[PDB]
Design a protein around this nucleic acid. Structure first.
Ligand SMILES: [Mg+2]
Ligand SMILES: [Mg+2]
Ligand SMILES: [Mg+2]
Ligand SMILES: [Mg+2]
Ligand SMILES: [Mg+2]
Ligand SMILES: [Mg+2]
Ligand SMILES: [Mg+2]
Ligand SMILES: [Mg+2]
Ligand SMILES: [Mg+2]
Ligand SMILES: [Mg+2]
Ligand SMILES: [Mg+2]
Ligand SMILES: [Mg+2]
Ligand SMILES: [Mg+2]
Ligand SMILES: [Mg+2]
Ligand SMILES: [Mg+2]
Ligand SMILES: [Mg+2]
Ligand SMILES: [Mg+2]
Ligand SMILES: [Mg+2]
Ligand SMILES: [Mg+2]
Ligand SMILES: [Mg+2]
Ligand SMILES: [Mg+2]
Ligand SMILES: [Mg+2]
Ligand SMILES: [Mg+2]
Ligand SMILES: [Mg+2]
Ligand SMILES: [Mg+2]
Ligand SMILES: [Mg+2]
Ligand SMILES: [Mg+2]
Ligand SMILES: [Mg+2]
Ligand SMILES: [Mg+2]
Ligand SMILES: [Mg+2]
Ligand SMILES: [Mg+2]
Ligand SMILES: [Mg+2]
Ligand SMILES: [Mg+2]
Ligand SMILES: [Mg+2]
Ligand SMILES: [Mg+2]
Ligand SMILES: [Mg+2]
Ligand SMILES: [Mg+2]
Ligand SMILES: [Mg+2]
Ligand SMILES: [Mg+2]
Ligand SMILES: [Mg+2]
Ligand SMILES: [Mg+2]
Ligand SMILES: [Mg+2]
Ligand SMILES: [Mg+2]
Ligand SMILES: [Mg+2]
Ligand SMILES: [Mg+2]
Ligand SMILES: [Mg+2]
Ligand SMILES: [Mg+2]
Ligand SMILES: [Mg+2]
Ligand SMILES: [Mg+2]
Ligand SMILES: [Mg+2]
Ligand SMILES: [Mg+2]
Lengths: 122, 131, 48, 32
RNA sequence: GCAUUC
RNA sequence: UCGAAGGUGGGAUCGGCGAUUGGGACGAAGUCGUAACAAGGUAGCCGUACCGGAAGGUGCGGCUGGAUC
RNA sequence: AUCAGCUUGUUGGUGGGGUGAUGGCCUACCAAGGCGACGACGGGUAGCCGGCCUGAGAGGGUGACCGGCCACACUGGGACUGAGAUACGGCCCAGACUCCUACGGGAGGCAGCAGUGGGGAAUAUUGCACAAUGGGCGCAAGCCUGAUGCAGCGACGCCGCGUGAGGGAUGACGGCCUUCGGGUUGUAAACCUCUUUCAGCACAGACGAAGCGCAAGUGACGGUAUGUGCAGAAGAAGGACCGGCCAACUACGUGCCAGCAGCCGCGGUAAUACGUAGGGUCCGAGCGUUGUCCGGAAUUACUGGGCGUAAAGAGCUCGUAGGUGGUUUGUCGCGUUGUUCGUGAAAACUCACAGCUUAACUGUGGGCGUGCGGGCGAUACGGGCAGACUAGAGUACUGCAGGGGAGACUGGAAUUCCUGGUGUAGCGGUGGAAUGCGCAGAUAUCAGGAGGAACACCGGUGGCGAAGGCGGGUCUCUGGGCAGUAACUGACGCUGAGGAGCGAAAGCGUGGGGAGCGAACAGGAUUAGAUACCCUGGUAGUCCACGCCGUAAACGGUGGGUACUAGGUGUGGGUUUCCUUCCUUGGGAUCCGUGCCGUAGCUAACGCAUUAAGUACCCCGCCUGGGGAGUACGGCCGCAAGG
């Protein structure tokens, strides 16, 4: 565009879609889970994926993935939710932190331990 | 309509230089004459003269091509233009091809090149780049 | 970097009504003579 | 370009016009 | 003339 | 006299829920056709109008981003 | 602007009032103004700044601490005292809440410091001093100071240091691979000597105080920091990653499972991607993850991008604000430029130098502070002002081509119907048939009549028009274009946000008309079906008058104006020179259209190429991944459809 046009209207930057809106600008949000249930991934992949439906202190209902090989969680469990996109799942945007609040660290972990809330063996 | 005689002058020069024309005819203006004088002194053109036409004077610029037909002007750019006019402080004068080209600066002292302007410590309007 | 032309209205005091519509006038700042008014008419410079 | 691009728009428009046909009287009664 | 589908 | 809070009144405006209802997106190996891509077996598409379970059909004007000659 | 009008003490004036002071600040009268697409009035969000983060810069984001302003002090209102008041630990009233009561009435306000409950992913001690610096009162000694100086707690951040150093073999054990040779871990370890930094145990022990009191005592931190001895490698390493980006690979265990993942993608009984182990790599008292901002992203492009076919030129014009401006003389010195002065607080940043054992940190002196204001200088360029000029633009005059538009009248061919001859039994239709029309006289053929619509040949990738568009003839009214001549005006130009007008076909309203054609609608055929294609019919409509509607692949999928940049060759409209018959499509030159082909240059390619998509300048429109969607909501327009 001509300079006159720029002077008249200007440049308008692309608006940024606010990601991870349900955290309300927090790094993590505490939540109580209503359902725990397995879910199917998108067509090329096939698995039973452990997922919880979590009511956050932000007053938003969210679906959260449960990372790790084995979980303790059931209804009314208190979990800490962080951001985390699981490509396979269609609507899932948040992951539950292992090792925080009611969620136990996954048993027999020896590598990547800090990401799964397992203490070092003595 | 005609809106920038100096841009027209530079593009007539550029197009004839591409076509390997030996001469360029222009409608005369005192500002075009002074630019042509600078181009002669800096070695980008061979010579120029003022002739008469039916209604006004004409500028004839003779282009300079070296042995093996090699263009003496590599590039020609209109910098200040109507509306978006460009002015430079004497300390911010533009460099053309890292200093191997010439910037033509209109000054209260007259038309000068970036080199002259910086020595005299004067700024002005940046008319064109030549390299 | 384009030079932009902008126009500002001003309210000026003249005691005698010597400057009519369309005329070119010189003004000088003064203290507040009322809300808005902060200019006085010095000289009607070129009438038209 | 490919007619595919036109065909996508065609379908959406056609379905909208058909929806407007079916709801014409409803839109009048609910717009009053 | 007619000739749908994977 | 001015005057906070309060009362009354008719509107603005921003949302939430709502029997019922509209379309949209996605989903595995469901049902019905086969409309488009080759002249896709009636060239396709654009605007508009009427019609038909559905894709879509037909009229009028337009385009080539249409094959064969 | 999916917020276009708002304002009546409101805009201005005079006489009073009010204040420290000016002023609708207040008030009475008088005038009818004031502010707004350079976004008024609304709606949403937000304390602002020095700075900070990022970035090559421009820019983007941000305002924690530290420093400067502002605002408020349970919520709302008010004034009083005073030099000064949002009066946090003042007052008065009203409200909400807590508390006391003898029920009459009273009393509170941590957004000071510390602390409690609560909310939350998350943020500390109900320390010690006024010794130092600042402040209040006092002549002063002094008193007061949760300002402040320090201490406590949290790897929360930055910086520094340690967890040992030298030597040590063809290279142990053990672990893990294997081609059963071995190879890795690995000089690593064991062992053999060497130094105790930081921690530990003793003994010294501050500076901060040319202070304070001059009475002679006085350091919160603190018996801390820091020195000097002692013992002994002694007490001190973890985290992530290892498919490609991206440094670092093998074995075993499950085999589309369990699981991994930032993206592409890895798991289907042989996985360097899953889990574990060995080995490796990157970092290290930290390492990862999530959230957030900048970068990469030239992906809003000022620096620094685009719109023929990828997303993008408004359907086409006219024109308002605005933007932009040919040649030349003089002048102003507003833009621009030089110089000087003032200012741009400190801190920060940056250069130098110094002080902490180094560093972080701290201090001192420059620069930085891009800006703004004042004085003085320059006048090329932009602009203002006063002139001049004719090349742009417009007018005049003389010629010329054209389906440009509007109105009226009118011509013939053909289809259909009607009337009447002649004349029969078929006609009509298809790929093949059947519905259908006939035998009550069709089709066919001849004559006459009616009526409506479209105009064969001319007629073309030809002409005209802004686009949509425009073809029988005549007449009337009327628009534009081109050439020649320079007679005239003297930059009057270009473009144009909004706005206005025109705008194929379909459609809509009222009144006419209705031959042919023909959505819908019927039958027939085809087919598994056939709401189609094909056949027979057939209503709106197609036509006219006057309105409305405002869309099209409204296309050159190419906005308008101007200048320049090899040619060749058709064709439409003018001028002119030569060859001359003066035959004339003889040929040249020139101006204005319209085609094809081709250079240079451009393009992702296809292609464009003097009629640009080339080289440039001015103005407008438009794009910013695909879907959702040119949809919803709001609004405007419309009779409706819908735009
Ligand atoms: Mg099927
Ligand atoms: Mg409902
Ligand atoms: Mg088909
Ligand atoms: Mg077809
Ligand atoms: Mg078919
Ligand atoms: Mg087709
Ligand atoms: Mg039909
Ligand atoms: Mg058609
Ligand atoms: Mg007074
Ligand atoms: Mg706020
Ligand atoms: Mg950058
Ligand atoms: Mg007082
Ligand atoms: Mg208090
Ligand atoms: Mg007080
Ligand atoms: Mg507190
Ligand atoms: Mg809590
Ligand atoms: Mg003191
Ligand atoms: Mg004293
Ligand atoms: Mg006290
Ligand atoms: Mg590598
Ligand atoms: Mg950028
Ligand atoms: Mg990014
Ligand atoms: Mg681009
Ligand atoms: Mg363009
Ligand atoms: Mg496109
Ligand atoms: Mg166009
Ligand atoms: Mg104008
Ligand atoms: Mg000029
Ligand atoms: Mg102007
Ligand atoms: Mg400073
Ligand atoms: Mg008419
Ligand atoms: Mg008969
Ligand atoms: Mg007959
Ligand atoms: Mg215009
Ligand atoms: Mg417009
Ligand atoms: Mg029509
Ligand atoms: Mg109708
Ligand atoms: Mg009608
Ligand atoms: Mg009618
Ligand atoms: Mg038919
Ligand atoms: Mg109209
Ligand atoms: Mg359109
Ligand atoms: Mg057309
Ligand atoms: Mg278009
Ligand atoms: Mg152009
Ligand atoms: Mg031509
Ligand atoms: Mg070409
Ligand atoms: Mg292109
Ligand atoms: Mg869409
Ligand atoms: Mg719509
Ligand atoms: Mg609506």
């Amino acid at each position: 565009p001509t300079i006159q046009q720029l002077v008249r209207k200007g440049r308008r930057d692309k608006i940024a879609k606010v990601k991870t809106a349900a955290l309300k600008g927090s790094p993590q949000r505490r939540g109580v889970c209503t359902r725990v249930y397995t879910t199917t991934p998108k067509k090329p992949n096939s698995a039973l994926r452990k997922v919880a439906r979590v009511k956050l202190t932000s007053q938003v209902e969210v679906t959260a993935y449960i990372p790790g090989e084995g979980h303790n969680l059931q209804e009314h469990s208190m979990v800490l939710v962080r951001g985390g996109r699981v490509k396979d799942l269609p609507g899932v945007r948040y992951k539950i932190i292992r090792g925080s609040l009611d969620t136990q660290g996954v048993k027999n972990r020896k590598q990547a331990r800090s990401r799964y809330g397992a203490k070092k063996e003595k | 309509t005609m809106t920038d005689p100096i841009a027209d002058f530079l593009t007539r020069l550029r197009n004839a230089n591409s076509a390997y024309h030996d001469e360029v005819t222009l409608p005369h203006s005192k500002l075009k004459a002074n630019i042509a004088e600078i181009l002669k002194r800096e070695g980008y053109i061979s010579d120029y003269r003022t002739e008469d036409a039916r209604v006004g004077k004409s500028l004839v610029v003779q282009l300079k091509y070296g042995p093996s037909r090699e263009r003496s002007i590599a590039g020609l750019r209109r910098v200040s233009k109507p509306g978006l006019r460009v002015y430079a402080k004497s300390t911010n004068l533009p460099r053309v091809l890292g200093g191997l080209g010439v910037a033509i600066i209109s000054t209260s002292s007259g038309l000068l090149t970036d080199r002259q302007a910086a020595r005299q410590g004067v700024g002005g309007e940046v008319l064109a780049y030549v390299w | 970097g384009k030079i932009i032309r902008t126009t500002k209205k001003v309210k000026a005091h003249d005691e005698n009504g010597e400057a009519g519509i369309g005329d070119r006038v010189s003004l000088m700042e003064t203290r507040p003579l009322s809300a808005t008014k902060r200019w006085r008419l010095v000289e009607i410079l070129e009438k038209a | 370009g490919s007619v595919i691009k036109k065909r996508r728009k065609r379908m959406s428009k056609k379905k909208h016009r058909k929806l407007l046909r079916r709801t014409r009287v409803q839109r009048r009664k609910l717009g009053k």
